[PDB]
Amino acid sequence: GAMGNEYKDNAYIYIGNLNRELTEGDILTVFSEYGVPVDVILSRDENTGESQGFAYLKYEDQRSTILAVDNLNGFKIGGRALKIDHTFYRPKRSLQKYYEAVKEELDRDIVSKNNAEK
């Protein structure tokens, strides 16, 4: 059984301290420039959901990684210059609802499956 565990798909970019006024919607809006809708993780308090200021975006594409990292590195959002670093993290299923809620918005695109019918 091979799922491609040697292939780091759980790779993503790390965004640094953002404005507390910035929400996941704003974050997705910024990445909408590249038109690549994939996983997005915003560090929010487990009780009140306070924006901790750390953002992550997991998209699968080696070309787009280096592109977005260099392109967004130094880009200002609300006065906050985006510092993009490389990092990898495996989403635990104990928090699947979070990532699922993310794909809930992406489902509008995910509906289009590969291979058109028979």
Binding site: E24, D26, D45, G49
Partner: peptide, 23 residues
């Protein structure tokens, strides 16, 4: 801490518009 021991976080896609004033 009865209401501080729960863990529930639901992504909220809202538009602040903070970046609108510079884009």
């Amino acid at each position: 801490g009865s209401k501080s021991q729960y863990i529930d976080i639901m992504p909220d896609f809202s538009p602040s518009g903070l970046l609108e004033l510079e884009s």
